[PDB]
Amino acid sequence: VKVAGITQDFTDGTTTNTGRGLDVAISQNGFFRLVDSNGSVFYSRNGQFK
Amino acid sequence: SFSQAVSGLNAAATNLDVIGNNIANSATYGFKSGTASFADMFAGSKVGLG
Amino acid sequence: MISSLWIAKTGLDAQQTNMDVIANNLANVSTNGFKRQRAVFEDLLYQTIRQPGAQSSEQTTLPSGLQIGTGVRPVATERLHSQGNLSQTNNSKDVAIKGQGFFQVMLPDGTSAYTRDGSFQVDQNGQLVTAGGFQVQPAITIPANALSITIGRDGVVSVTQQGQAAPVQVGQLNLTTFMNDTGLESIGENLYIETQSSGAPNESTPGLNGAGLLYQGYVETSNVNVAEELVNMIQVQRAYEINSKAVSTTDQMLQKLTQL
């Protein structure tokens, strides 16, 4: 048997309110886009911002 | 007289190979287990060939 | 000075060659992309004291003649081009070929050899070479600042650059197939070259015209079955001992004849 590669489940998690205002959550399809100092483009769904 | 014993050795090795393949290919979703079948050989009569 | 002595000498030599091929097969059992060797013999000529079916009289014939053998001669030690087990290494610069074909390699003298072992590296200039400094014939060059190298199911190889959001194709790995795969003469470092025995190679992309497929991250191990080499060795040892016994018997009868 050979591993065909791990696949990730994109099912949305539970939306939990933990106070504060500088935080966003996505309940459906959508990926936040980020750019690093070197200029590359990355995609993440984390809601922590500062 | 090594012919019969060698043939039996190869048959046992093949059976172990099939068993090992079945046990190793566990958890594979689209898998159906295998099974080896054997058959004797005779030249005429009273003359075994493994 | 006795025909039996020469016959037994030929038998001893045949068993010695068989033992040699067994030893070589057992030696490189872990060599990647190694094909085992099998030796095949034949009987030598025959001395006909009485011709079979000779007209012994006007209406009767000999049902069987009188013929004496002259020993055994090894025909050839061919190489069995079976399919080796595909291991897994999770590397980026080694490919396993499943099916038929060979990678072409540009020898330093100028000609080209053919290999079955896929373990590629990069030389100082950046071009893809095999383990041993020999470069592939299409001369695939890997550019600097390469984030990753991918090789598809077919021969196309691409490299992901730092940016551009898209991989860029860098070349293709076409492999060559022969007609008489067992007719290629083998030289060192897992290389083969063609002779009169094998036809002119025809190159093609993997997956077409009977060619194999390329899997990245795997490697083809040798098709040496260590389980049966031992029993073959046992049989070879017994046969060699019996031939030596025949030599000893001939010597004994000669000695007890010359004592007169």
Short mmCIF file of C-alpha atoms in Angstrom, two decimals:
data_model
loop_
_atom_site.label_atom_id
_atom_site.label_comp_id
_atom_site.label_asym_id
_atom_site.label_seq_id
_atom_site.Cartn_x
_atom_site.Cartn_y
_atom_site.Cartn_z
CA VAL A 1 0.00 0.00 0.00
CA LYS A 2 1.23 3.49 -0.87
CA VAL A 3 -0.07 6.72 0.63
CA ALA A 4 -1.93 8.80 -1.95
CA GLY A 5 -1.48 12.00 0.04
CA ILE A 6 -3.27 13.52 3.01
CA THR A 7 -6.39 15.54 2.23
CA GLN A 8 -7.78 18.23 4.53
CA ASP A 9 -11.42 18.68 5.53
CA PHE A 10 -12.63 22.23 4.87
CA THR A 11 -15.74 21.94 7.05
CA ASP A 12 -16.30 25.15 8.99
CA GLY A 13 -15.89 24.95 12.75
CA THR A 14 -18.10 26.31 15.50
CA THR A 15 -18.27 30.11 15.66
CA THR A 16 -17.46 31.23 19.21
CA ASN A 17 -17.70 34.80 20.48
CA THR A 18 -14.75 35.65 22.74
CA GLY A 19 -15.25 39.39 23.15
CA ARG A 20 -13.19 42.15 21.53
CA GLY A 21 -13.84 43.72 18.14
CA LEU A 22 -10.65 43.25 16.13
CA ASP A 23 -11.55 39.70 15.12
CA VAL A 24 -13.58 38.28 12.25
CA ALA A 25 -15.04 34.85 11.53
CA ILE A 26 -16.27 33.22 8.32
CA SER A 27 -19.25 30.87 8.53
CA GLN A 28 -19.08 29.81 4.86
CA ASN A 29 -16.70 29.73 1.90
CA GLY A 30 -14.00 32.40 1.89
CA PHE A 31 -10.26 32.75 2.51
CA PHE A 32 -8.49 35.79 3.92
CA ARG A 33 -5.56 36.89 1.78
CA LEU A 34 -2.29 38.02 3.36
CA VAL A 35 0.94 39.43 1.97
CA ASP A 36 4.28 39.00 3.72
CA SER A 37 7.26 41.36 3.77
CA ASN A 38 8.95 39.52 0.89
CA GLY A 39 5.80 40.11 -1.18
CA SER A 40 4.44 36.56 -1.40
CA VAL A 41 0.69 35.96 -1.18
CA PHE A 42 -0.73 33.49 1.35
CA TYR A 43 -4.27 32.37 2.19
CA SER A 44 -5.63 31.70 5.67
CA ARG A 45 -8.96 31.62 7.49
CA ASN A 46 -7.70 32.56 10.96
CA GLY A 47 -9.51 35.51 12.53
CA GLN A 48 -6.80 36.95 14.80
CA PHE A 49 -5.67 40.46 13.84
CA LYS A 50 -3.75 43.22 15.59
CA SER B 1 13.37 -34.88 -5.75
CA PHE B 2 13.95 -31.20 -5.07
CA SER B 3 11.30 -30.28 -7.65
CA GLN B 4 8.26 -31.13 -5.52
CA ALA B 5 9.66 -29.53 -2.38
CA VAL B 6 10.73 -26.38 -4.23
CA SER B 7 7.29 -26.07 -5.83
CA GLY B 8 5.63 -26.45 -2.43
CA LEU B 9 7.99 -23.83 -1.02
CA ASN B 10 7.03 -21.41 -3.80
CA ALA B 11 3.33 -22.09 -3.20
CA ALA B 12 3.68 -21.39 0.52
CA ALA B 13 5.66 -18.23 -0.23
CA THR B 14 2.91 -17.06 -2.60
CA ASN B 15 0.26 -17.77 0.03
CA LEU B 16 2.20 -15.76 2.61
CA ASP B 17 2.64 -12.96 0.06
CA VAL B 18 -1.12 -12.83 -0.52
CA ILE B 19 -1.83 -12.85 3.22
CA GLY B 20 0.67 -10.05 3.81
CA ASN B 21 -0.79 -7.98 0.99
CA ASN B 22 -4.29 -8.37 2.42
CA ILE B 23 -3.23 -7.45 5.95
CA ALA B 24 -1.11 -4.52 4.76
CA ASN B 25 -3.83 -3.12 2.48
CA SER B 26 -6.22 -2.72 5.40
CA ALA B 27 -8.09 0.59 5.77
CA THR B 28 -7.96 1.07 1.97
CA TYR B 29 -11.49 2.14 1.09
CA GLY B 30 -11.85 0.55 -2.33
CA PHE B 31 -10.17 -2.77 -1.58
CA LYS B 32 -11.31 -6.38 -1.91
CA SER B 33 -9.20 -9.04 -0.21
CA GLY B 34 -7.43 -11.70 -2.25
CA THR B 35 -7.13 -15.46 -2.01
CA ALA B 36 -4.78 -17.91 -3.71
CA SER B 37 -5.95 -21.23 -5.13
CA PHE B 38 -3.76 -24.28 -5.69
CA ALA B 39 -3.81 -27.30 -7.99
CA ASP B 40 -1.72 -30.46 -8.10
CA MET B 41 0.24 -31.62 -11.15
CA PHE B 42 0.72 -35.18 -12.41
CA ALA B 43 2.60 -36.27 -15.52
CA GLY B 44 0.75 -39.54 -15.99
CA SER B 45 -0.30 -41.46 -12.91
CA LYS B 46 1.64 -42.28 -9.73
CA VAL B 47 4.12 -39.57 -10.80
CA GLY B 48 3.76 -36.42 -8.72
CA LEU B 49 5.12 -33.09 -9.90
CA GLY B 50 4.42 -30.76 -6.99
CA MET C 1 43.67 -38.53 -21.63
CA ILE C 2 40.24 -40.14 -21.16
CA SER C 3 37.03 -38.81 -22.68
CA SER C 4 35.25 -39.13 -19.33
CA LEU C 5 37.83 -36.81 -17.77
CA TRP C 6 37.16 -34.05 -20.30
CA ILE C 7 33.40 -34.53 -19.94
CA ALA C 8 33.67 -34.19 -16.17
CA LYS C 9 35.86 -31.10 -16.59
CA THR C 10 33.16 -29.49 -18.73
CA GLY C 11 30.56 -30.35 -16.09
CA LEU C 12 32.71 -28.83 -13.35
CA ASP C 13 33.13 -25.63 -15.35
CA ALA C 14 29.39 -25.39 -16.02
CA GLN C 15 28.58 -25.76 -12.33
CA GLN C 16 31.28 -23.20 -11.50
CA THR C 17 29.67 -20.66 -13.84
CA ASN C 18 26.27 -21.38 -12.28
CA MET C 19 27.73 -20.77 -8.82
CA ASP C 20 29.33 -17.54 -10.05
CA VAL C 21 26.05 -16.14 -11.35
CA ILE C 22 24.33 -17.14 -8.11
CA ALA C 23 27.02 -15.36 -6.09
CA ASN C 24 26.75 -12.22 -8.21
CA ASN C 25 22.96 -12.22 -7.89
CA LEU C 26 23.17 -12.56 -4.11
CA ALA C 27 25.87 -9.87 -3.90
CA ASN C 28 23.88 -6.90 -5.22
CA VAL C 29 20.47 -7.72 -3.81
CA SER C 30 19.93 -4.15 -2.58
CA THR C 31 21.07 -2.43 -5.79
CA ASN C 32 18.33 -0.20 -7.17
CA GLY C 33 17.13 -1.25 -10.60
CA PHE C 34 19.21 -4.43 -10.83
CA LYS C 35 18.03 -7.34 -12.98
CA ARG C 36 19.07 -10.84 -11.94
CA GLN C 37 21.02 -13.18 -14.22
CA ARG C 38 20.07 -16.67 -15.37
CA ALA C 39 22.53 -19.07 -16.98
CA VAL C 40 21.37 -21.53 -19.65
CA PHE C 41 23.51 -24.43 -20.92
CA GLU C 42 23.42 -26.94 -23.76
CA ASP C 43 24.90 -30.32 -24.58
CA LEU C 44 28.05 -30.48 -26.69
CA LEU C 45 28.53 -32.54 -29.86
CA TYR C 46 28.12 -36.30 -30.13
CA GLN C 47 30.43 -39.06 -31.35
CA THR C 48 28.47 -41.58 -33.44
CA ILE C 49 30.00 -45.04 -33.24
CA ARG C 50 27.01 -46.53 -35.08
CA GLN C 51 24.69 -44.30 -37.07
CA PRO C 52 21.09 -44.50 -35.78
CA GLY C 53 18.70 -46.05 -38.27
CA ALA C 54 21.60 -47.49 -40.25
CA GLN C 55 20.72 -50.08 -42.89
CA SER C 56 22.02 -53.10 -41.00
CA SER C 57 20.70 -55.47 -43.67
CA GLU C 58 18.46 -55.60 -46.73
CA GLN C 59 15.23 -55.28 -44.73
CA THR C 60 16.18 -54.51 -41.10
CA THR C 61 17.56 -51.37 -39.46
CA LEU C 62 18.95 -50.36 -36.09
CA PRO C 63 16.12 -48.83 -34.01
CA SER C 64 18.68 -46.76 -32.08
CA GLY C 65 22.31 -45.99 -32.80
CA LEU C 66 25.36 -45.69 -30.59
CA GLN C 67 26.18 -42.10 -29.62
CA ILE C 68 28.46 -40.78 -26.88
CA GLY C 69 28.19 -37.25 -25.56
CA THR C 70 31.12 -34.88 -25.16
CA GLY C 71 29.93 -32.81 -22.20
CA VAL C 72 28.09 -29.55 -21.55
CA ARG C 73 28.60 -25.98 -22.73
CA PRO C 74 26.94 -22.90 -21.18
CA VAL C 75 24.92 -21.15 -23.88
CA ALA C 76 24.51 -17.77 -22.24
CA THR C 77 24.01 -15.88 -18.99
CA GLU C 78 21.06 -13.67 -19.85
CA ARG C 79 19.50 -10.94 -17.71
CA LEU C 80 15.84 -11.26 -16.73
CA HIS C 81 14.13 -7.91 -17.36
CA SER C 82 11.25 -8.39 -14.96
CA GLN C 83 9.64 -5.58 -12.94
CA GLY C 84 11.16 -4.65 -9.61
CA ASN C 85 9.23 -3.71 -6.50
CA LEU C 86 8.48 0.00 -6.24
CA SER C 87 9.67 1.28 -2.87
CA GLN C 88 8.90 4.74 -1.47
CA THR C 89 11.45 7.36 -0.47
CA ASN C 90 9.53 10.69 -0.37
CA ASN C 91 12.36 12.49 -2.15
CA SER C 92 12.10 15.01 -4.98
CA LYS C 93 14.88 13.93 -7.37
CA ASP C 94 14.28 10.19 -7.87
CA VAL C 95 11.75 8.61 -10.22
CA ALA C 96 10.62 5.01 -10.63
CA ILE C 97 9.69 3.72 -14.08
CA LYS C 98 6.78 1.26 -14.03
CA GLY C 99 6.64 -0.76 -17.24
CA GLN C 100 9.26 -0.65 -19.99
CA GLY C 101 11.89 1.79 -21.21
CA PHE C 102 15.19 3.32 -20.19
CA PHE C 103 16.66 6.72 -19.40
CA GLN C 104 19.24 7.85 -21.95
CA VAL C 105 22.59 9.03 -20.60
CA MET C 106 25.32 10.99 -22.39
CA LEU C 107 28.66 9.29 -21.77
CA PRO C 108 31.81 11.46 -21.54
CA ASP C 109 33.32 9.90 -24.67
CA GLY C 110 30.34 11.05 -26.73
CA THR C 111 28.07 8.04 -27.16
CA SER C 112 24.94 7.29 -25.14
CA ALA C 113 24.14 4.54 -22.65
CA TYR C 114 20.83 3.52 -21.11
CA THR C 115 19.91 3.10 -17.46
CA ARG C 116 16.97 1.81 -15.44
CA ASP C 117 17.90 3.19 -12.00
CA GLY C 118 16.25 6.52 -11.24
CA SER C 119 18.24 8.54 -8.70
CA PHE C 120 18.96 11.99 -10.09
CA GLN C 121 21.00 14.87 -8.71
CA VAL C 122 22.15 18.30 -9.86
CA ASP C 123 25.71 19.04 -10.87
CA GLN C 124 27.55 22.29 -10.22
CA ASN C 125 26.28 23.88 -13.45
CA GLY C 126 22.65 23.16 -12.56
CA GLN C 127 21.82 20.44 -15.10
CA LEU C 128 20.14 17.19 -14.08
CA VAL C 129 22.59 14.28 -13.91
CA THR C 130 22.61 10.72 -12.64
CA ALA C 131 24.55 9.43 -9.64
CA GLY C 132 28.02 9.28 -11.17
CA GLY C 133 28.21 12.65 -12.90
CA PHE C 134 26.63 11.54 -16.18
CA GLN C 135 24.00 13.90 -17.58
CA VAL C 136 20.71 12.96 -19.20
CA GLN C 137 20.60 13.19 -22.99
CA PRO C 138 17.86 15.88 -23.30
CA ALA C 139 20.06 18.00 -20.98
CA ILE C 140 17.48 19.16 -18.46
CA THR C 141 18.86 22.12 -16.49
CA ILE C 142 17.37 23.10 -13.12
CA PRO C 143 17.45 26.90 -12.64
CA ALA C 144 18.64 28.46 -9.41
CA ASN C 145 16.25 29.78 -6.73
CA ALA C 146 14.01 26.76 -7.29
CA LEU C 147 11.33 26.33 -4.63
CA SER C 148 10.25 22.83 -5.70
CA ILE C 149 10.58 20.35 -8.55
CA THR C 150 7.60 18.32 -9.76
CA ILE C 151 7.53 15.51 -12.32
CA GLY C 152 4.17 14.54 -13.77
CA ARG C 153 2.86 11.14 -14.73
CA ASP C 154 4.33 11.68 -18.20
CA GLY C 155 7.85 12.95 -18.84
CA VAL C 156 7.14 16.66 -18.31
CA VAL C 157 9.16 18.17 -15.45
CA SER C 158 8.38 21.61 -14.04
CA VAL C 159 9.93 23.81 -11.37
CA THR C 160 8.11 26.30 -9.13
CA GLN C 161 9.93 29.64 -9.02
CA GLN C 162 9.93 32.13 -6.15
CA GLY C 163 6.99 34.01 -7.64
CA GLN C 164 4.85 34.08 -10.82
CA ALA C 165 2.12 32.12 -8.95
CA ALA C 166 2.54 29.31 -11.49
CA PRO C 167 5.12 26.58 -12.15
CA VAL C 168 7.15 26.84 -15.34
CA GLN C 169 7.97 23.85 -17.53
CA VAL C 170 11.69 23.12 -17.81
CA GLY C 171 11.79 20.02 -20.01
CA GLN C 172 10.52 16.53 -20.70
CA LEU C 173 11.92 13.07 -19.90
CA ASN C 174 11.34 10.91 -22.94
CA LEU C 175 12.52 7.33 -22.47
CA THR C 176 13.71 4.85 -25.08
CA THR C 177 12.41 1.32 -25.62
CA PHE C 178 14.06 -1.61 -27.40
CA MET C 179 12.87 -4.81 -29.07
CA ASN C 180 15.27 -7.30 -27.44
CA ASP C 181 15.62 -5.82 -23.94
CA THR C 182 17.58 -8.92 -22.87
CA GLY C 183 20.05 -8.29 -25.71
CA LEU C 184 21.56 -5.08 -24.35
CA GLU C 185 25.13 -5.54 -23.16
CA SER C 186 25.64 -4.24 -19.63
CA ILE C 187 28.60 -2.17 -18.43
CA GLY C 188 29.34 -0.90 -14.94
CA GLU C 189 27.38 1.68 -12.95
CA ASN C 190 23.95 0.33 -13.95
CA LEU C 191 24.42 1.22 -17.62
CA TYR C 192 23.48 -0.66 -20.77
CA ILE C 193 24.40 -0.21 -24.42
CA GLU C 194 22.90 -1.66 -27.57
CA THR C 195 24.46 -4.20 -29.93
CA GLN C 196 23.37 -6.26 -32.91
CA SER C 197 21.21 -8.38 -30.59
CA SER C 198 18.90 -5.50 -29.65
CA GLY C 199 17.26 -3.33 -32.27
CA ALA C 200 17.58 0.39 -32.71
CA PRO C 201 15.99 2.14 -29.70
CA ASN C 202 12.84 4.16 -30.27
CA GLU C 203 12.25 7.06 -27.89
CA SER C 204 8.81 8.08 -26.69
CA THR C 205 7.03 9.93 -23.92
CA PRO C 206 6.03 7.73 -20.97
CA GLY C 207 2.66 6.03 -21.23
CA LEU C 208 2.60 5.60 -25.02
CA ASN C 209 3.88 3.02 -27.51
CA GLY C 210 4.27 0.45 -24.74
CA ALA C 211 6.42 2.73 -22.59
CA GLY C 212 6.14 2.84 -18.81
CA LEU C 213 5.00 5.53 -16.41
CA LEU C 214 7.08 7.76 -14.15
CA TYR C 215 6.32 7.93 -10.42
CA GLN C 216 8.05 10.56 -8.33
CA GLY C 217 9.36 9.76 -4.86
CA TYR C 218 9.69 6.01 -5.49
CA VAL C 219 12.58 3.80 -6.57
CA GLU C 220 12.74 0.40 -8.27
CA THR C 221 14.51 -2.23 -6.18
CA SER C 222 16.27 -5.29 -7.59
CA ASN C 223 14.14 -8.27 -8.58
CA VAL C 224 16.33 -10.75 -6.71
CA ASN C 225 14.40 -13.38 -4.75
CA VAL C 226 16.75 -14.35 -1.94
CA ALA C 227 14.42 -17.18 -0.93
CA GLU C 228 15.23 -19.39 -3.93
CA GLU C 229 18.90 -18.46 -4.37
CA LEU C 230 19.67 -20.58 -1.30
CA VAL C 231 18.04 -23.74 -2.66
CA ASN C 232 19.69 -23.13 -6.04
CA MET C 233 23.01 -22.88 -4.19
CA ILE C 234 22.31 -26.20 -2.45
CA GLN C 235 21.60 -27.92 -5.77
CA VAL C 236 24.71 -26.39 -7.36
CA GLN C 237 26.87 -27.59 -4.47
CA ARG C 238 25.55 -31.14 -4.72
CA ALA C 239 26.02 -31.25 -8.49
CA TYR C 240 29.59 -29.95 -8.18
CA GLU C 241 30.37 -32.60 -5.57
CA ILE C 242 28.97 -35.35 -7.81
CA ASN C 243 31.06 -34.19 -10.78
CA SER C 244 34.15 -34.20 -8.57
CA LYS C 245 33.22 -37.75 -7.56
CA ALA C 246 33.12 -38.74 -11.23
CA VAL C 247 36.58 -37.23 -11.76
CA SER C 248 37.88 -39.18 -8.76
CA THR C 249 36.40 -42.43 -10.08
CA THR C 250 38.07 -41.93 -13.46
CA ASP C 251 41.38 -41.22 -11.73
CA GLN C 252 41.00 -44.35 -9.60
CA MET C 253 40.34 -46.63 -12.56
CA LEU C 254 43.24 -45.13 -14.51
CA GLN C 255 45.56 -45.58 -11.52
CA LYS C 256 44.56 -49.20 -10.98
CA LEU C 257 44.99 -49.85 -14.71
CA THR C 258 48.49 -48.38 -14.97
CA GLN C 259 49.70 -50.41 -11.97
CA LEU C 260 50.13 -53.41 -14.28
#
